[PDB]
Each structure stands twice: as C-alpha cells, then as structure tokens.
Amino acid sequence: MLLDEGWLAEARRVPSPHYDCRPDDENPSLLVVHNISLPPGEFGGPWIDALFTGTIDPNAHPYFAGIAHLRVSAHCLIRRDGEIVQYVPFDKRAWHAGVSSYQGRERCNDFSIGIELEGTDTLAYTDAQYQQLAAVTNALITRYPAIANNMTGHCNIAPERKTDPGPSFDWARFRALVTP
Numbered sequence: 001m002l003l004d005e006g007w008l009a010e011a012r013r014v015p016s017p018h019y020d021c022r023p024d025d026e027n028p029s030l031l032v033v034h035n036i037s038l039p040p041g042e043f044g045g046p047w048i049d050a051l052f053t054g055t056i057d058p059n060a061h062p063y064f065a066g067i068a069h070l071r072v073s074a075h076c077l078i079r080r081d082g083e084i085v086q087y088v089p090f091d092k093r094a095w096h097a098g099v100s101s102y103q104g105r106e107r108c109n110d111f112s113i114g115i116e117l118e119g120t121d122t123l124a125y126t127d128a129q130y131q132q133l134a135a136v137t138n139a140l141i142t143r144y145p146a147i148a149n150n151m152t153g154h155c156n157i158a159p160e161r162k163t164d165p166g167p168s169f170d171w172a173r174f175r176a177l178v179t180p
C-alpha cells in the first residue's frame, strides 16, 4: 500500500506531540519491531494512544504512575484485530528505542522507524497482525530500500534492557510475507 507525505494511507492518524527531527534529516534505514500492552498483558484499551501522546492518566492503573514520567512515542501501533494506528510521520524522529545500538551506531531513534505490535513476549501475535505488519513493512521498503536489509527487534538493539518483541515474534513467518 502507499505512503502519503510520510503517513500510512490506510492507518488511523493520531498525531502525537512526541517527536522531533532526525539529525541531518537522514532517511530511516532500519525497522525496529516492538511490543506493548497497557496495562501489561491486557489489550484493547485507550492507554497506548495516550502514553504515546503524553496524556496518560498516571492514576488510571497502578502501572501507569511509573510511565507518566516517560516521554516516549512510536511511529505505528498494530492492534490485535489488525487496526493500524499512526502517531508520527516516518521522516520524523519518534522516541521508541531509548538507549540502543545497531552495528556500531547508537541512538537508533535517529535512523530507525518503530512499529509496535499490541501483545507480549510470550503470547502469540494474531494472523491480522502478521498480515498488517507485512503490508506496512512492504510499504516502507518501497520508500526506503535499505530497510529490506535492516529489520530487527527492540531486544536486538537493547539487549539486557528490552525483551520486546520476545520469542513470540515469528521472524520466519514475517520475512516470508516481506519483499514479495
């Protein structure tokens, strides 16, 4: 599917304040796969959208207090039913990696795009999510050729800090649907 001025043509647009420029206005070359669930283990709620736009209610759930002090964001979320939500245009810097490193290069926010799958490290992701993530990645690949050769997990760039997307993420099934 197509890209429209840095946005997904087939995604809900949820413009977050949480973003800034990529240095040198560099084109992103890496894809970083994440997972997220709020509160942990639960799906469907409004909390992901809120955390990413800086408006989560610290008090809504015991878990949220901690993350309110956070200022994070991703480019896209793909929900359990496959719904795609976008928060940042791809040309811009979302705040999804944190302290990280790929192939010698730190600060992966700089040169990566970050896509989250609603889910956990130990729960299976859905058929919709596999199809949708593939769609999106094929899109990016058309735009940024280099991403074909650079696709990783948050756990792979922040080892012993992050575990997402976990053993649950079937890299076999995912590559298969990519660069068709």
Ligand SMILES: [Zn+2]
Pocket (backbone or CB within 6 Å): 033, 034, 035, 096, 154, 155, 162, 164
């Ligand atoms: Zn992550």
